[PDB]
Amino acid sequence: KGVLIAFEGIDGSGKSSQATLLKDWIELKRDVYLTSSDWIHDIIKEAKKKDLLTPLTFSLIHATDFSDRYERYILPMLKSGFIVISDRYIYTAYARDSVRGVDIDWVKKLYSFAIKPDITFYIRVSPDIALERIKKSKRKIKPQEAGADIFPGLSPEEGFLKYQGLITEVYDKLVKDENFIVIDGTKTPKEIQIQIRKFVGELID
Amino acid sequence: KGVLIAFEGIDGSGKSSQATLLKDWIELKRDVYLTEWNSSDWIHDIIKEAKKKDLLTPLTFSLIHATDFSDRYERYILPMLKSGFIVISDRYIYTAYARDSVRGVDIDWVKKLYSFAIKPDITFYIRVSPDIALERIKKSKRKIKPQEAGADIFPGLSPEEGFLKYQGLITEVYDKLVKDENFIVIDGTKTPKEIQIQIRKFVGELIDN
């Protein structure tokens, strides 16, 4: 077959967890592969020493990384009959880049080397709820989760509310045209995963 | 106003001398900055070093170079143009069109990739057969470099045969770009002095507006 399943959603939506749980369950009965690089973090640090990293260049750094993971792991897995689960796919780029002022149509063209998923789950949830949950986890908000480059003044919590809110707007815009399966991430991880397992379970026959 | 002047041509075409010779002349009257496409910067080095043990596809190479160029363009080229400099580029985005498309990257995709970059006010294509460029390299008594021979695409060829085949493919891309990109086609078979006088006439009339 070769089935591409993508997960999208804001940081704190639990999509990573839902992706892993899906793989672990799909492994029981089918070959499956679950999908950033250190150098990206090195580019950002060095860029900070340099007083410049444009949204354009930021977009292209991530596309470069994605092209490598796509051509090295995703596409070959797919060609050889794996189910591929991607925790974050091209739609993450569409949102990350367009919120920074990069023309989304250009981003679409940029990533047009990559196939559309067979299924994309959008785990949709209020940023307020995602923040509350990260707050109960006692975990600190990373600069990237707070859109620190866009909102350099703010507390990480306020940054996160605004930045993840902007990301949500782009995801909501893609739903109809990209055929996202929207999942209410207000639900528990168990309810969400059971619902997803039943849905993908339409590969069982 | 800032002006961008690009030179394109194969290795051995002399386009680098022509770019330098033009810079030596414009410099006498105006602020000019000479850059080379091949002068990659810091992003290029971080990514390639970090991936030195991995085999990269032509697509990923294409993107590393566009990424590095996007930074060069915003950091150096564009502000120099905005400041009224004349920018001369010894090879420009058209060199990436050729290097990438010859290695199977869709050329329309590559054009869209570099659409953030302005087109040159003038592009001089210093056109010469690979055979003549090869003879000139041989007479100079230096070796053909693997990159000049497209040794990644043609590892089973001698440097000379690799040069002829690879530079022949680059020539084909450039020829195919002439009409859409309004290249000024210069006969690179003429003397360096004669070629330069033509370039200076075209550039003179451009700066004269």
Amino acid at the residue A156: P
Contact of A63 with A21, CB cutoff 8 Å: no
Is B74 in contact with A63 (Cβ distance < 8 A)? no
Could you give the CA distance from residue B93 to residue B208 in angstroms, rounded to a whole number? 26
Could you give the CA distance from residue B155 to residue B168 in angstroms, rounded to a whole number? 16
Please enumerate in sequence order all residues whose Cβ is within 8 A of that of A108, keeping only pairs 6 or more positions apart, or say none: A94
Could you give the CA distance from residue B151 to residue A1 in angstroms, rounded to a whole number? 37
- Nearest by CB to A39, which of B46, B60, B116? B46
Homologous superfamily, domain B1-209: P-loop containing nucleotide triphosphate hydrolases (3.40.50.300)
Could you give the CA distance from residue B80 to residue B78 in angstroms, rounded to a whole number? 5
One DSSP character per residue, chain A reads: --EEEEEE--TTS-HHHHHHHHHHHHTTTS-EEE---HHHHHHHHHHHHHT---HHHHHHHHHHHHHHHIIIIIHHHHHTT-EEEEES-HHHHHHHHHHTT--HHHHHHHTTTSPPPSEEEEEE--HHHHHHHHHHTTPPPPTTTTTTTT-TTS-HHHHHHHHHHHHHHHHHHHHHHHT-EEEETTS-HHHHHHHHHHHHTTT--
CA dist list (Å): A69 to A25, A74, A133? 23, 7, 30
Does any CB of chain A come closer than 8 Å to the CB of residue B115?
Answer: yes
A63 interaction partners in chain B (CB closer than 8 Å): 63, 67
- Beta strands A3-8 and A119-124 are parallel
Could you give the CA distance from residue A127 to residue A115 in angstroms, rounded to a whole number? 29
Contact of A15 with A124, CB cutoff 8 Å: no
CB atoms within 10 A of CB A42: 15
The reply to whether A10 sits in an annotated binding site is: yes
* B72 SS3 class: helix
Please enumerate in sequence order all residues whose Cβ is within 8 A of that of A194, keeping only pairs 6 or more positions apart, or say none: none
Does any CB of chain B come closer than 8 Å to the CB of residue A155?
Answer: no
Contact of B174 with B183, CB cutoff 8 Å: yes
Contact of A55 with A62, CB cutoff 8 Å: no
Q: For residue A53, how far is the Cα from the chain centroid?
A: 22
Backbone angles phi, psi at A5, to 5 degrees: -120, 120
Resolution, Å (one decimal): 2.2
The number of residues making up chain B comes to 209
Could you give the CA distance from residue A172 to residue A137 in angstroms, rounded to a whole number? 26
| Domain coordinates in residue numbering, chain A | 1-205
Among residues A127, A138, A121, A120, the alpha carbon closest in space to that of A192 is found at A121
Sign of CA dihedral A144, A177, A86, A55: negative
Please enumerate in sequence order all residues whose Cβ is within 8 A of that of B34, keeping only pairs 6 or more positions apart, or say none: B19, B20, B23, B88, B90
Is B71 in contact with A64 (Cβ distance < 8 A)? no
Could you give the CA distance from residue B133 to residue A132 in angstroms, rounded to a whole number? 67
Give B15-18 contacts, CB < 8 A, sequence gap 24+.
B15/B90, B15/B91, B15/B124, B15/B126, B15/B188, B16/B90, B17/B192, B18/B124, B18/B126, B18/B192, B18/B195, B18/B196, B18/B199
DSSP assignment, residue B153? T
Could you give the CA distance from residue B144 to residue B132 in angstroms, rounded to a whole number? 14
| Helix, strand counts (H, E) of chain B | 9, 5
Is B56 in contact with A46 (Cβ distance < 8 A)? no
Is A52 in contact with B71 (Cβ distance < 8 A)? yes
Q: How many CB pairs under 8 A join A and B?
A: 66
Is B113 in contact with A112 (Cβ distance < 8 A)? no
Could you give the CA distance from residue A166 to residue A151 in angstroms, rounded to a whole number? 12
The residue assigned the tokens 């055979």 is B131
Amino acid at the residue A96: R
Sign of CA dihedral B135, B98, B19, B34: negative
Experimental method: X-ray
Q: Which CATH architecture has domain A1-205?
A: 3-Layer(aba) Sandwich (3.40)
B64 interaction partners in chain A (CB closer than 8 Å): 64
B42 is written with which tokens? Answer: 């810091």
Please enumerate in sequence order all residues whose Cβ is within 8 A of that of B97, keeping only pairs 6 or more positions apart, or say none: B107, B110, B111, B114, B173, B177
Q: Nearest 5°: CA angle at B69, between B63 and B75?
A: 145
Helix (H) or strand (E) holding B90: strand B86-90
CB atoms within 10 A of CB B82: 10
Contact of A185 with A9, CB cutoff 8 Å: yes
CA dist list (Å): A180 to A5, A16, A19? 11, 17, 15
The residue assigned the tokens 């990257």 is B105
Amino acid at the residue B66: A
